[PDB]
Paper text:
SARS-CoV-2, the COVID-19 pathogen, relies on its main protease (MPro) for replication and pathogenesis. MPro is a demonstrated target for the development of antivirals for SARS-CoV-2. MPro is a cysteine protease that uses four binding pockets, S1, S2, S4, and S1′–3′, in the active site to engage P1, P2, P4 and P1′–3′ residues in a protein substrate for binding. Our results indicated that MPro has a flexible S2 pocket to accommodate inhibitors with a large P2 residue and revealed that dipeptidyl inhibitors with a large P2 spiro residue such as (S)-2-azaspirononane-3-carboxylate and (S)-2-azaspirodecane-3-carboxylate have favorable characteristics.
Because the N-terminal group of MPI1 is similar to that in most Group A compounds, we chose to conduct X-ray crystallography analysis of MPro bound with MPI48 and MPI49 in Group A because both have an N-terminal group not based on CBZ. For MPro-MPI48, the structure was determined with a resolution of 1.85 Å. The electron density at the active site of MPro-MPI48 clearly showed the bound inhibitor and allowed the unambiguous refinement of all nonhydrogen atoms. There was continuous electron density that connected the thiolate of MPro C145 with the P1 Cα atom of MPI48, indicating a covalent bond formation. The electron density around the P1 Cα of MPI48 allowed the refinement of a hemithioacetal hydroxyl group that had an S confirmation and pointed exactly at the anion hole with a hydrogen bond distance to three backbone α-amines from MPro residues G143, S144, and C145. The P2 t-butyl group fit neatly to the S2 pocket and was in close distance to side chains of H41, M165, and E189. In MPro-MPI48, there was also no strong electron density at this region to allow refining its structure, indicating a high structural flexibility of aa45–51. MPI48 has an N-terminal 1H-indole-2-carbonyl (e) group. It used its carbonyl oxygen and indole nitrogen to form a hydrogen bond with the E166 α-amine and α-carbonyl oxygen, respectively. The hydrogen bond between the MPI48 indole nitrogen and the E166 α-carbonyl oxygen is unique to MPI48 and other dipeptidyl inhibitors with an N-terminal 1H-indole-2-carbonyl (e) group or analogue.
Residue numbers in the entry:
A (entry chain A), B (entry chain A): 1 to 306
The structure:
Amino acid sequence: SGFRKMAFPSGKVEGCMVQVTCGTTTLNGLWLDDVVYCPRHVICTSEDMLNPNYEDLLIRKSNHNFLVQAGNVQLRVIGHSMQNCVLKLKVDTANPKTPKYKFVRIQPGQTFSVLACYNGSPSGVYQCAMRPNFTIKGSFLNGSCGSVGFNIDYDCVSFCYMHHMELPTGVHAGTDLAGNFYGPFVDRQTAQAAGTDTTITVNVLAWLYAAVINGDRWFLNRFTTTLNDFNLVAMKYNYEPLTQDHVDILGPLSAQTGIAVLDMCASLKELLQNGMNGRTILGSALLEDEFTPFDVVRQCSGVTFQ
Amino acid sequence: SGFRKMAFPSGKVEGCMVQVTCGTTTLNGLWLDDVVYCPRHVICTSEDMLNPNYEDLLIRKSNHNFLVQAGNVQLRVIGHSMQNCVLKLKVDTANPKTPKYKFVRIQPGQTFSVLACYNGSPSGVYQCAMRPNFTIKGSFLNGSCGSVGFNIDYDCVSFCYMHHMELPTGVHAGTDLAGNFYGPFVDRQTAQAAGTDTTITVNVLAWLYAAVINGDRWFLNRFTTTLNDFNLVAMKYNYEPLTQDHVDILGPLSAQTGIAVLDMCASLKELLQNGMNGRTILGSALLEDEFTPFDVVRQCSGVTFQ
Ligand SMILES: *[C@H](O)[C@H](C[C@@H]1CCNC1=O)NC(=O)[C@H](CC(C)(C)C)NC(=O)c1cc2ccccc2[nH]1
Ligand SMILES: *[C@H](O)[C@H](C[C@@H]1CCNC1=O)NC(=O)[C@H](CC(C)(C)C)NC(=O)c1cc2ccccc2[nH]1
């Protein structure tokens, strides 16, 4: 028992992280086979970053302008090209530690592990959710661009996120590994705001099931509700609508605990209207929405990865 | 910016994890050089576990009784021996992925990363604190024994924890890597209770500094307090006493923010007496005590590891 915000083991990704330096700028690259992936704004300088033209900037670069450092080994760039907001640097060495991998774009409400890196060297690992407004609440300092987010499915690493920037509210924005930003953001220093966020209802309910599986039952009740009457209560509290598909995904957790999904909704309704009256759920005094139904089943059952 | 509960990159430890099977019992081992370390209760069976005699049980075992599995390679045991509550299995192969390492015993109030493992395969990584009562609030299922806790100092892995058991309150107990339990626990199935816990005051204050560094200032105030008058308030709220040494450790965070340690204490005093009035600090509605001053300086400055 117990429930922790738990990241994937980071070793498979640690072996892909490199340092990319171009001019004054140093950030992180992702080295897979003979390509290093990094954020295209590495080719910028501080006055380039106001409103740059990256196509113009890139034709001006030379292969030898990109210093790619894999630990204490320098990698020879033999080709560069832009793909949306990422750079693909072709190097003269395939990464011998390339895991089996995929580039996947996630949906808001889904989670992933982030390997925060600086100068090509991993600093820490932690779990994040893609918020409804397409930001993530990360932990990122200058130099962390090119850190990646990922999930692991048996032996296969699905890269979903590359870090690019911090918004003025302290939340973070980036791209998938094809270079396409999550959300309405651009890799330019202009007035960009996150946009209003909502709480991920299905994750809150999955986390209530985690808590029941782990002994926390005080918030349960005999009442029930219709999906329609719950969703009226969701709108009022800036919770996202609950669909029949969400109810389905929560079926295994319903079966395991014997608490009908709509019954848990009635519990959520009362927690929303009454608060928690000084009590805690799984050691939190807030309703937690960054655990998926998958995350709960994975942790409360013991799945591993090879 | 941002502040996340952040684990160390787990790759160096993933390469040490193996599967140890003896009779009916399978758990995890830690393979360093030519020794696999695992919890001694692997030699038990279900009726052995009521009140076993491990010395008696071990003389009855044979080297070939221990099946040690490193991924899909079987390791030949050529020697076994007991050290307190751990077994040291000598194998005929040094682990080529042995990082530079140390066995260190931590103090309550200190943190470490846990690599949860099942059948020798890492499942997830997360950050834990050693509680004042010598338990940790982990996430551990049957089969997770032999998972280890660790910190990384540049390139060197300091192993501090081996998992052994869950107490009836759902908290976890284990040993250092020399086999010595943290706290008054034994690797026997008898009536064992955690014992009353306290909140780690110095960590709460370090986390308040993290929050100030990250923009959360609402809880600050012009008042101050003496260390003596704060510690009266600590006892009342089951917080642990604050020493002059704690005040010293918090000096760099004091210097950085310009908030005198004793001033932050005055803020903590009011949060304890008044609560948080529906507000949050770093996205938590509780006072958080599982971040050390070190953890805060590390995350809010960007230290990495090679
Ligand atoms: C890349 O290492 C870096 C990561 C961010 C630094 C601080 N926290 C981070 O996550 N990215 C950048 O520095 C961005 C570069 C551009 C805009 C070219 C993508 N810049 C920002 O993140 C940035 C600049 C700002 C100015 C004013 C307010 C907020 C800002 N964010
Ligand atoms: C080792 O894989 C396992 C890990 C725990 C299983 C459930 N969560 C865990 O962390 N350890 C054990 O199974 C312990 C074996 C002994 C006692 C020999 C060290 N047993 C327990 O943790 C255990 C048995 C209990 C019985 C009744 C209440 C609580 C118990 N904990």
